Design a protein around this ligand. Structure first.
Ligand code: MG
Ligand code: MG
Ligand code: MG
Ligand code: MG
Ligand code: MG
Ligand code: MG
Ligand code: MG
Ligand code: MG
Ligand code: MG
Ligand code: MG
Ligand code: MG
Ligand code: MG
Ligand code: MG
Ligand code: MG
Ligand code: MG
Ligand code: MG
Ligand code: MG
Ligand code: MG
Ligand code: MG
Ligand code: MG
Ligand code: MG
Ligand code: MG
Ligand code: MG
Ligand code: MG
Ligand code: MG
Ligand code: MG
Ligand code: MG
Ligand code: MG
Ligand code: MG
Ligand code: MG
Ligand code: MG
Ligand code: MG
Ligand code: MG
Ligand code: MG
Ligand code: MG
Ligand code: MG
Ligand code: MG
Ligand code: MG
Ligand code: MG
Ligand code: MG
Ligand code: MG
Ligand code: MG
Ligand code: MG
Ligand code: MG
Ligand code: MG
Ligand code: MG
Ligand code: MG
Ligand code: MG
Ligand code: MG
Ligand code: MG
Ligand code: MG
Ligand code: MG
Ligand code: MG
Ligand code: MG
Ligand code: MG
Ligand code: MG
Ligand code: MG
Ligand code: MG
Ligand code: MG
Ligand code: MG
Ligand code: MG
Ligand code: MG
Ligand code: MG
Ligand code: MG
Ligand code: MG
Ligand code: MG
Ligand code: MG
Ligand code: MG
Ligand code: MG
Ligand code: MG
Ligand code: MG
Lengths: 150, 64, 49, 102, 9
RNA sequence: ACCCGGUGAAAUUGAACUGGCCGUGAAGAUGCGGCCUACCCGUGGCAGGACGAAAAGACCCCGUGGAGCUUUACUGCAGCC
RNA sequence: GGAUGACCCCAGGCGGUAGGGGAGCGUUCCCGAUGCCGAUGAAGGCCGACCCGCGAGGGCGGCUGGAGGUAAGGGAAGUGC
RNA sequence: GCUGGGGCUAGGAGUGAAAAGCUAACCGAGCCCGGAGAUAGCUGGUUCUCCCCGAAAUGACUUUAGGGUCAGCCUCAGGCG
RNA sequence: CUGUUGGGAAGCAGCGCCAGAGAGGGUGAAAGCCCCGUAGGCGAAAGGUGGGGGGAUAGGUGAGGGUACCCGAGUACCCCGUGGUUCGUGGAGCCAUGGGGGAAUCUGGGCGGACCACCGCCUAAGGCUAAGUACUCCGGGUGACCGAUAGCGCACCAGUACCGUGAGGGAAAGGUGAAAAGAACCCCGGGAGGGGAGUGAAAUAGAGCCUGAAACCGUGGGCUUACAAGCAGUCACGGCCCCGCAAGGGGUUGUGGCGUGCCUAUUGAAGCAUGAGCCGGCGACUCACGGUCGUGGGCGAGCUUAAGCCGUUGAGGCGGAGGCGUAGGGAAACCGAGUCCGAACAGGGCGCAAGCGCAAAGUCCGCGGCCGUGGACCCGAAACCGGGC
RNA sequence: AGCCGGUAGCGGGCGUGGAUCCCUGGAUGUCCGAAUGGGGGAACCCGGCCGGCGGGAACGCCGGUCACCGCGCUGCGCGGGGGGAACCUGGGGAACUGAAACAUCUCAGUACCCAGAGGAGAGGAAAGAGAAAUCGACUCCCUGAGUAGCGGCGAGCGA
């Protein structure tokens, strides 16, 4: 191919933007802002995803999701990420953490809890926690140690 | 620059897996002197309607 | 990647020259003919993979 | 500082212009204007100077400057480019065939 | 000019 | 002031080929309707009109506009105790 | 009608402000150019009762002008009063 | 009493035989520069072309009433049909 | 190099040639080879730099036991008053401090968010310390940067002229020609300025000079007009004038018919509501980062990189920290294809349930609409505050 | 191999016994200006002490020297003043505006004043971070992260 040969196929040459140019482009004079007042003016309106015109907004609902934390902030506790048997029905090695995340299922700072639905491959599954239900399902095919080391 | 999460909203509303917005019910605070037991028990959670789309717009980044 | 060679086709109007690690679509398309030694084709092949 | 390839002593071919082919000794070099006068361009300079020295006098001849890129140096042949060959002291200019000027 | 006259008449 | 020679501005100005009456029309028409009157162009004058000019109405009201002032308005500060 | 468009049919729809949407036309600049056009005349200027386009415009011709201009296809905006 | 020359006091400050006078031809708070492209829910203006559709001037709440948020009425895409 | 058309060759044509050099600029126009250069190479006696290489000097380096001498003072610490930190008195720590009180030397002291205990981290009240980072008066390079109302205020002797007591404000104004060859001389005129002559390719290129647009002001010609009523046009006929063999077309207007300027603002304007003397230039929907839909693609239970690193006649790769997605519920503990409320295996609320190699959840860029934060469509206040005059 | 700047002209010179011009160093450098002997309305006025000059005592000129502060020696020596486009640190420090009013809050340690440092400044050898029997000075970039949190729990601020 040449350069006088290139070009983008349809929908991507949409590059055509809008306007406040002539009459019978539409979009002229009042520039699609209508005759109007506040919204037509330069600054625009208050944040319209939030402002309700002076009456109390829907900030009339209430905080229940209590304990928003106190000044020192978040407490560093452990956190466990779920995986499903189905997802780990992929490979057929010894299935461990680190090995799991190094594949796209965990996220670095999360302790491994296998669980959930799927068919239990006959395999050893090194895990930090198991669901009552997935512990049983896979106990009918393979081994499943629990963790905790320094 | 980056948009900011409206903390007034994050503290009192929730986005469901489907994308609904759930909050509690107004009215169980405060004046229960003798609202009927039906009344005060009737206050669990509800779903706001088309107008929680506005909320969802103020929790861009929270996601799910 | 043959420096002495790249040195000698340079000034010709019809020749644009390029080391193997330069390979890029624009310069490919720009020209009508591609001429690369049995090396380069090496590192080209290593790119795609 | 203003180079130029021809000198006051040199002989030149007029390589272009309306005096192409003409040969002459350059008599004047004005590096600032980048120009040489030879025997080439001479124009009806209307010596207005009636009243002063040199009365009546409708017009005057005189040889007017040429852009120095339009002249070329020459020696036992035609005009040839200058190549400098260093000696054990100074460096002579010499043509692309032997040894121009001395 | 600069006024400064007040609106009288 | 006016006439002649000399020098020669201004605010203003959508464009103009710019009449009256009775009507009509955003309710006060040279410009629309009907009729009436009126050859083309100036100069000296008069000011009824062009809702004449000049100043984004000073009155009034509006804006969650601004200042000056007041006090047993609020909240501060100087000062004093 | 299978021609797979911008071909021939038949039938309907097409007042329009705020607006929504869809097609395009010009202006500056980049790739296309170490190319092409340009003194036998570039851009720009002044005419046309001629050709093409629904139109914005694009062509052709003559006079002016004297040295620059830039296709098809795309890209980017200080883009049309 | 008037007046010459030489001096001093200034911006929330001077000075005032008191008017809110005067403080470099505008003083109910000087002038210049800067924050500053202050803010203006107000006024004005917002430039090329063609094609299809095409409203509202209502209700609720609003220190809200010439401004807004949700609904209603418009348009476009996708789906159901 | 030659010839060719041209005022001028570099264009065009004919045979050549260089190239680690075909970046660019200049030469009467359009040059790889005419000029300056470019690639590639060389150069300081003197001054400056020297973070790179070498050398020297200062300076410093060990174990055991015993003594308990020393280890930064109105300091720690506590209180009152405050500042700093994301922390607005909050359960308020830590770090600074003005006031008051006021220790200790290793079994001494501060801290790990009031406090206490336990377990740990540190060793305050003395100081110095390159590099990596910010900036651009100055030098250089590049440009999908401006091209004289633009681009800095100034391309031109501009922070000038000018304005103001002063601080301060602040302009306008670039181009003959390749070369002045800038028009000798005669003629009118006091000059100015013309007419000839002459230079030049071009003299409406003649110097209040390239191109010379429009408003505006003239002269000449064609048509038309003094019984005529006018948003000035339009539609019909008609006459006169000019083109075209012809048919037709242009200019003009006599008569007849029809006819309430433009814009804004409005329930409604020809409006006696707004704005516009006319013309030409300048002049208003942006961009950055986020976000939400749509769309063009890449890969798809995955997708994707950021800083930075290396490589570049504008050549791209590496880099997986991280982000978004595969699980959802619950204030949370926690549980999990479910969970929550609940005594409940009632109920209900949020949730989960795979399309037939193609395709797709999802992601990453390009593009487009709109939103968020920013002067965010442009213009404009009355004012407020700071430092100066 | 030309040259006496822009700059031609009148009128004179220099250069191949090496000019103009470019680079380095050196020389001179009136007077004002931190301005510094003392005054002062900047570019002017008046001096002291030593040496020189003219007949030179009165006068005048030339050369040298004489401000103040800080530090170190017992009057001497070392240093300091002022300036700089932006950038930097510290000592002070607003208001319009945002909150659709407004006072806590925001704007914002922003603008600006002031002092000082430099080619950078600041910071920097742990009475530190922090939950990892863990990191190891400081600084800058990217993440972490609009997260933890802060807030008339408002607008917003923000590790
Ligand atoms: Mg419209
Ligand atoms: Mg409108
Ligand atoms: Mg308007
Ligand atoms: Mg506004
Ligand atoms: Mg809303
Ligand atoms: Mg209210
Ligand atoms: Mg609401
Ligand atoms: Mg309660
Ligand atoms: Mg209950
Ligand atoms: Mg996130
Ligand atoms: Mg090449
Ligand atoms: Mg007269
Ligand atoms: Mg009349
Ligand atoms: Mg009437
Ligand atoms: Mg009419
Ligand atoms: Mg009438
Ligand atoms: Mg009158
Ligand atoms: Mg009037
Ligand atoms: Mg008014
Ligand atoms: Mg109010
Ligand atoms: Mg205000
Ligand atoms: Mg229509
Ligand atoms: Mg052009
Ligand atoms: Mg513009
Ligand atoms: Mg007073
Ligand atoms: Mg004044
Ligand atoms: Mg006065
Ligand atoms: Mg005041
Ligand atoms: Mg005031
Ligand atoms: Mg501001
Ligand atoms: Mg403004
Ligand atoms: Mg509003
Ligand atoms: Mg319709
Ligand atoms: Mg209205
Ligand atoms: Mg819709
Ligand atoms: Mg549809
Ligand atoms: Mg070189
Ligand atoms: Mg110590
Ligand atoms: Mg605080
Ligand atoms: Mg403490
Ligand atoms: Mg600690
Ligand atoms: Mg603790
Ligand atoms: Mg520590
Ligand atoms: Mg340009
Ligand atoms: Mg121009
Ligand atoms: Mg300018
Ligand atoms: Mg200017
Ligand atoms: Mg003449
Ligand atoms: Mg000409
Ligand atoms: Mg020209
Ligand atoms: Mg001209
Ligand atoms: Mg008649
Ligand atoms: Mg008619
Ligand atoms: Mg009205
Ligand atoms: Mg009205
Ligand atoms: Mg009007
Ligand atoms: Mg009128
Ligand atoms: Mg009026
Ligand atoms: Mg009005
Ligand atoms: Mg008017
Ligand atoms: Mg937009
Ligand atoms: Mg988008
Ligand atoms: Mg997208
Ligand atoms: Mg359930
Ligand atoms: Mg702003
Ligand atoms: Mg915007
Ligand atoms: Mg002095
Ligand atoms: Mg205020
Ligand atoms: Mg406010
Ligand atoms: Mg330092
Ligand atoms: Mg802050």
């Amino acid at each position: 191919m040449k350069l006088s040969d290139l070009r983008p196929n349809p929908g991507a040459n949409k590059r055509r933007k809008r306007v406040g140019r002539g009459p019978g482009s539409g979009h002229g004079k009042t520039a699609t802002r209508g005759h109007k007042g506040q919204k037509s003016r330069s600054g625009g309106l208050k944040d319209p995803r939030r402002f309700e015109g002076g009456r109390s907004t829907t900030l009339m609902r209430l905080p229940k999701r209590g304990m928003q934390g106190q000044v020192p902030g978040e407490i560093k506790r452990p956190r466990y990420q779920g995986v499903n048997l189905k997802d780990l029905a992929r490979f057929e090695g010894e299935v461990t953490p680190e090995l799991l995340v190094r594949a796209g299922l965990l996220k670095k700072g999360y302790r491994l809890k296998i669980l959930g639905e799927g068919e239990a491959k006959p395999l050893k599954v090194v895990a930090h926690a198991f669901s009552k239900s997935a512990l049983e399902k896979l106990k009918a095919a393979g081994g499943e140690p629990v963790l905790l080391e320094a | 620059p980056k948009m900011k999460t409206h903390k007034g909203a994050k503290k009192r509303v929730k986005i469901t897996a489907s994308g609904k917005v759930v909050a509690m019910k107004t009215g169980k605070r405060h004046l229960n002197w003798q609202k009927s037991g039906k009344e005060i028990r009737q206050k669990g959670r509800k779903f706001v309607l088309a107008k929680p789309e506005a909320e969802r717009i103020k929790l861009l980044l929270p996601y799910e | 990647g043959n420096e002495l060679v790249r040195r000698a086709a340079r000034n010709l109007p019809w020749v644009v020259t390029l080391a193997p690690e330069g390979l890029n679509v624009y310069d490919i398309v720009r020209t009508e003919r591609l001429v690369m030694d049995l090396d380069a084709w090496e590192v080209f092949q290593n790119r795609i993979g | 500082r203003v180079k130029m390839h021809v000198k006051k002593g040199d002989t030149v071919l007029v390589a272009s212009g309306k005096y192409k082919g003409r040969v002459g000794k350059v008599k004047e070099v004005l590096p600032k204007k980048y120009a040489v006068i030879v025997e080439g361009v001479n124009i009806v300079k209307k010596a207005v100077r009636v009243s002063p020295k040199y009365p009546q006098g409708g017009f005057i001849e005189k040889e007017a400057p040429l852009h120095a890129s339009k002249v070329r140096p020459i020696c036992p042949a035609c005009g040839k480019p200058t190549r400098v060959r260093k000696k054990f002291l100074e460096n002579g200019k010499k043509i692309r065939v032997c040894a121009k000027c001395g | 000019x600069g006024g400064p006259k007040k609106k009288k008449k």
